[PDB]
Scaffold this active site. Structure first.
Site, PDB file in Angstrom:
ATOM      1  N   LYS A  39       0.905  -1.248  -0.055  1.00  0.00           N
ATOM      2  CA  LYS A  39      -0.080   0.202   0.030  1.00  0.00           C
ATOM      3  C   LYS A  39       0.808   1.310   0.050  1.00  0.00           C
ATOM      4  CE  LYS A  39      -4.234   1.411   2.360  1.00  0.00           C
ATOM      5  NZ  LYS A  39      -4.904   1.354   3.480  1.00  0.00           N
ATOM      6  N   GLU A  88      -0.295  -8.185   4.442  1.00  0.00           N
ATOM      7  CA  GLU A  88      -0.811  -9.500   4.049  1.00  0.00           C
ATOM      8  C   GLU A  88      -1.948  -9.140   2.817  1.00  0.00           C
ATOM      9  OE1 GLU A  88      -3.123 -11.305   7.324  1.00  0.00           O
ATOM     10  OE2 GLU A  88      -3.702 -12.986   6.089  1.00  0.00           O
ATOM     11  N   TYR A  89      -1.744 -10.228   1.932  1.00  0.00           N
ATOM     12  CA  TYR A  89      -2.460 -10.067   0.887  1.00  0.00           C
ATOM     13  C   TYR A  89      -3.921 -10.764   0.945  1.00  0.00           C
ATOM     14  CZ  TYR A  89      -4.085 -11.341  -3.898  1.00  0.00           C
ATOM     15  OH  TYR A  89      -4.943 -11.283  -5.244  1.00  0.00           O
ATOM     16  N   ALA A  90      -5.049 -10.267   0.739  1.00  0.00           N
ATOM     17  CA  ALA A  90      -6.226 -10.860   0.936  1.00  0.00           C
ATOM     18  C   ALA A  90      -6.930 -11.095  -0.558  1.00  0.00           C
ATOM     19  CB  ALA A  90      -7.051 -10.235   1.635  1.00  0.00           C
ATOM     20  N   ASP A 133     -15.285   1.086  13.759  1.00  0.00           N
ATOM     21  CA  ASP A 133     -15.474   1.318  12.424  1.00  0.00           C
ATOM     22  C   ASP A 133     -15.345   0.468  11.614  1.00  0.00           C
ATOM     23  OD1 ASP A 133     -15.877   3.988  10.419  1.00  0.00           O
ATOM     24  OD2 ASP A 133     -13.981   3.423   9.862  1.00  0.00           O
ATOM     25  N   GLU A 137     -16.728  -2.566   3.796  1.00  0.00           N
ATOM     26  CA  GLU A 137     -15.504  -2.416   3.061  1.00  0.00           C
ATOM     27  C   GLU A 137     -14.213  -2.447   3.778  1.00  0.00           C
ATOM     28  OE1 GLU A 137     -18.386  -0.614   3.821  1.00  0.00           O
ATOM     29  OE2 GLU A 137     -17.880   1.522   3.304  1.00  0.00           O
ATOM     30  N   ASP A 151      -8.470  -2.168   8.651  1.00  0.00           N
ATOM     31  CA  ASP A 151      -8.162  -0.675   9.099  1.00  0.00           C
ATOM     32  C   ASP A 151      -7.968  -0.558  10.492  1.00  0.00           C
ATOM     33  OD1 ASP A 151     -10.146  -0.898   6.693  1.00  0.00           O
ATOM     34  OD2 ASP A 151      -9.345   1.121   6.329  1.00  0.00           O
TER      35      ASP A 151
HETATM   36  N1  LIG Z   1      -4.133  -6.674   1.651  1.00  0.00           N
HETATM   37  C1  LIG Z   1      -4.964  -6.462   0.898  1.00  0.00           C
HETATM   38  N2  LIG Z   1      -5.228  -7.397  -0.217  1.00  0.00           N
HETATM   39  C2  LIG Z   1      -5.878  -7.345  -1.123  1.00  0.00           C
HETATM   40  N3  LIG Z   1      -6.605  -6.390  -1.649  1.00  0.00           N
HETATM   41  C3  LIG Z   1      -6.380  -5.222  -0.867  1.00  0.00           C
HETATM   42  C4  LIG Z   1      -5.722  -5.074   0.403  1.00  0.00           C
HETATM   43  N4  LIG Z   1      -5.684  -3.959   1.050  1.00  0.00           N
HETATM   44  C5  LIG Z   1      -6.228  -3.068   0.189  1.00  0.00           C
HETATM   45  N5  LIG Z   1      -6.811  -4.079  -0.934  1.00  0.00           N
HETATM   46  C6  LIG Z   1      -7.845  -3.408  -1.898  1.00  0.00           C
HETATM   47  O1  LIG Z   1      -7.432  -2.131  -2.114  1.00  0.00           O
HETATM   48  C7  LIG Z   1      -8.681  -1.189  -1.781  1.00  0.00           C
HETATM   49  C8  LIG Z   1      -7.900  -0.136  -1.086  1.00  0.00           C
HETATM   50  O2  LIG Z   1      -8.340   0.158   0.063  1.00  0.00           O
HETATM   51  P1  LIG Z   1      -7.849   0.580   1.320  1.00  0.00           P
HETATM   52  O3  LIG Z   1      -6.571  -0.219   1.392  1.00  0.00           O
HETATM   53  O4  LIG Z   1      -8.897   0.239   2.627  1.00  0.00           O
HETATM   54  O5  LIG Z   1      -7.808   2.263   1.185  1.00  0.00           O
HETATM   55  P2  LIG Z   1      -8.518   3.277   1.832  1.00  0.00           P
HETATM   56  O6  LIG Z   1      -9.142   2.746   3.024  1.00  0.00           O
HETATM   57  O7  LIG Z   1      -7.464   4.429   1.845  1.00  0.00           O
HETATM   58  O8  LIG Z   1      -9.414   3.550   0.749  1.00  0.00           O
HETATM   59  C9  LIG Z   1      -9.485  -2.247  -1.037  1.00  0.00           C
HETATM   60  O9  LIG Z   1     -10.681  -1.752  -1.179  1.00  0.00           O
HETATM   61  C10 LIG Z   1      -9.450  -3.423  -1.400  1.00  0.00           C
HETATM   62  O10 LIG Z   1     -10.035  -3.970  -2.666  1.00  0.00           O
HETATM   63 MG   LIG Z   2     -11.009   0.743   4.021  1.00  0.00          MG
END
Ligand SMILES: Nc1ncnc2c1ncn2[C@@H]1O[C@H](COP(=O)(O)OP(=O)(O)O)[C@@H](O)[C@H]1O
Ligand SMILES: [Mg+2]
Ligand SMILES: Nc1ncnc2c1ncn2[C@@H]1O[C@H](COP(=O)(O)O)[C@@H](O)[C@H]1O
Lengths: 256, 82
Positions: A39, A88-90, A133, A137, A151
């Site tokens: 990220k 971690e990748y989801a 929270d 999402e 988060d």
């Molecule tokens: N660890 C992760 N593995 C897979 N997809 C992720 C992961 N972290 C974020 N994502 C994807 O990328 C998007 C980025 O959102 P997030 O990381 O919550 O950023 P923000 O909260 O700043 O909008 C998520 O909605 C999700 O689809």
């Molecule tokens: Mg989020």
């Protein structure tokens, strides 16, 4: 283990998503070939919203959380313009997207999610971390479909907040029990229980805990959600009482 | 202290209209704000503890007021004796 991390430690793949302050990428650590997510947060947009203070707190908390139902933060590094979080990748995406895809979840999938969330939250509460929270999402899915909490004066999203928060009273860890109730209902029904066409109406329904169930929601589910969505925080169950609720034990899957 | 005191005056007026009352504003005791997201928008709510006179007798009320400063918007959500 590792002294320090750098961008050169990772092969990068496709964008996984656009967040508020940058993008998330598929990544792979070069020595192990283990698949991760990177990220990238742009410092400028972090200043421009003064989120910085929270990022610090996020990183420090999420750094010390180790739980199967909480997304790991393996490490971090920064440069002039960016912060990098090694996560971690989801692979199965957000619960938000799965709910949009499916409209609603059966009792087994819901009960499983609720078990995983309650286990995650119980660990957090024991570390004196309150999430406050949790919404679809912010929930990701691992390779076996296991839930991962993502988060760690804007109070939150109205539909997910309890009476004590929306009414400007004091609150504590019991807020997460309310959230669990909202989530369980939303999983089963496809929308949160106090949803309305105005925020004024949503506010009123929450403050008065006025909600009903469609007729396909079973007696067991109703019993659990009704315990969780109590106006008085004191009267809401402990997380351990969720984990042993009869509807949870009858319906939940055990970790792969 | 400025825009707040006004907001309180507005809360008292909206109460008087909704309940057919004649409360007279005295002062603001305490005041908080929070913001919420709903769908794609953001709304603030003010929580005001105010003294006002009901038939001459000073009493404490809590008002909750919605404020969207951008569109010159304000709206009484609730107004209650403490
Ligand atoms: N660890 C992760 N593995 C897979 N997809 C992720 C992961 N972290 C974020 N994502 C994807 O990328 C998007 C980025 O959102 P997030 O990381 O919550 O950023 P923000 O909260 O700043 O909008 C998520 O909605 C999700 O689809
Ligand atoms: Mg989020
Ligand atoms: N802009 C930043 N955002 C987030 N974390 C940062 C930032 N700059 C430094 N850090 C690291 O975040 C943590 C908070 O500070 P500390 O833990 O005291 O070093 C440390 O790992 C910092 O070095």
């Amino acid at each position: 283990k590792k002294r320090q991390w750098a961008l050169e430690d990772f092969e990068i793949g496709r964008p996984l998503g656009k967040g508020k302050f940058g993008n998330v990428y598929l990544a792979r650590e070069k020595q192990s070939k283990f698949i991760l997510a990177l990220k990238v947060l742009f410092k400028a947009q972090l200043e421009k919203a003064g989120v910085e203070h929270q990022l610090r707190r996020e990183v420090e908390i999420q750094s010390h959380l180790r739980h199967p139902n909480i997304l790991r933060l393996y490490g971090y590094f920064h440069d002039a313009t960016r912060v990098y979080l090694i996560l971690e990748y989801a692979p199965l995406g957000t619960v938000y997207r799965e709910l949009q895809k499916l409209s609603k979840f059966d009792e087994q999938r819901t009960a499983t999610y609720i078990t995983e969330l309650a286990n995650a939250l119980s660990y957090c509460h024991s570390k004196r971390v309150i999430h406050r929270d949790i919404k679809p999402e912010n929930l990701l899915l691992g390779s076996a479909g296991e839930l991962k909490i993502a988060d760690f004066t804007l109070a939150g999203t109205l539909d997910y907040l309890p009476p004590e928060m929306i009414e400007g009273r004091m609150h504590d860890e019991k807020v997460d029990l309310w959230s669990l109730g909202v989530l369980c209902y939303e999983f089963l029904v496809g929308k949160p229980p106090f949803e309305a066409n105005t925020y004024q109406e949503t506010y009123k329904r929450i403050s008065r805990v006025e909600f009903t169930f469609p007729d396909f929601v079973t007696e067991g589910a109703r019993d659990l959600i009704s315990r969780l969505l109590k106006h008085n925080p004191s009267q809401r169950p402990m997380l351990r009482e969720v984990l042993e609720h009869p509807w949870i034990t009858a319906n939940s899957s055990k970790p792969s | 202290s400025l825009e707040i005191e006004e907001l309180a005056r507005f809360a008292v007026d909206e109460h008087n209209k909704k309940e057919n009352a004649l409360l007279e504003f005295v002062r603001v005791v305490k005041a908080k704000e929070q913001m919420f997201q709903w769908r794609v928008e953001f709304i603030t709510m003010y929580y005001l503890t105010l003294e006002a006179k009901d038939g001459g007798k000073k009493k404490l009320y809590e008002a909750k007021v919605w404020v969207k400063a951008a569109e010159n918007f304000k709206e009484l959500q609730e107004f209650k004796p403490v």
